[PDB]
From a paper:
Among the >600 human ubiquitin ligases, UBR4 plays a particularly important PQC role, being an essential and conserved E3/E4 ligase found across eukaryotes. Aside from teaming up with various ubiquitin ligases, UBR4 activity is linked to two specific cofactors: calcium-binding protein calmodulin (CALM1) and KCMF1 (13, 16, 17, 20, 21). Our data show that the evolutionarily conserved UBR4 complex forms a megadalton E4 arena, in which inward-facing ZZ-DZB domains of KCMF1 act not as E3 ligases but as substrate receptors. The architecture of the E4 megacomplex is conserved across eukaryotes, but species-specific adaptations allow UBR4 to perform its precisely tuned quality-control function in diverse cellular environments.
We turned to Arabidopsis thaliana UBR4 (also known as BIG), which diverged from metazoan UBR4 early in eukaryotic evolution and has distinct roles in hormone signaling. Instead, an internal ZZ domain is found in AtUBR4 itself. To explore whether the plant ZZ domain displays distinct specificity to HsKCMF1-ZZ we determined the co-crystal structure of the AtUBR4-ZZ in complex with an NRS containing peptide. We observed multiple differences in the substrate binding pocket, for example a specific interaction of the peptide’s R1 residue with a serine residue in the ZZ motif, whereas the corresponding residue in HsKCMF1 ZZ is a leucine. In agreement with this, ITC showed that the AtUBR4 ZZ domain binds to NRA and NRR peptide sequences, whereas HsKCMF1 ZZ domain did not. Thus, the AtUBR4 complex could act as a traditional type 1 N-degron receptor, consistent with in vivo studies.
Numbering used by the authors:
A (entry chain B), B (entry chain A): 2611 to 2669
The structure:
Amino acid sequence: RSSVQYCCDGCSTVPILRRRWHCTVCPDFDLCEACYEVLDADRLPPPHTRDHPMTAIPI
Amino acid sequence: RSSVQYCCDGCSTVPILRRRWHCTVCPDFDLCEACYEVLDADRLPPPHTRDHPMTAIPI
Ligand code: NI
Ligand code: NI
Ligand SMILES: [Zn+2]
Ligand SMILES: [Zn+2]
Ligand SMILES: [Zn+2]
Ligand SMILES: [Zn+2]
């Protein structure tokens, strides 16, 4: 079956499991826990920027 | 990001990797390689039946 899943925009892991750090500003941007913790601020995929508020959403 | 992935109707693994055994008759039915090889038809969710032709589709 076809299933909607969240894929990390930092590392392309899919599905993100347990929780996803979601951008409140971008249209459709999510990070897994590891990317949220380790991705460098100047290496975020544009147009996401480091000032965008992120929220932890249960999967 | 939101992403369409294939989820196995036999074991619920998602994404199916490599290839998916896809039902030609049902609306949206897929098995991973492992389920296709070892699950008996009585274990598969109605309305899928053993006479439905299945085709291997690369992921
Ligand atoms: Ni949102
Ligand atoms: Ni089809
Ligand atoms: Zn990631
Ligand atoms: Zn953003
Ligand atoms: Zn399976
Ligand atoms: Zn079927």
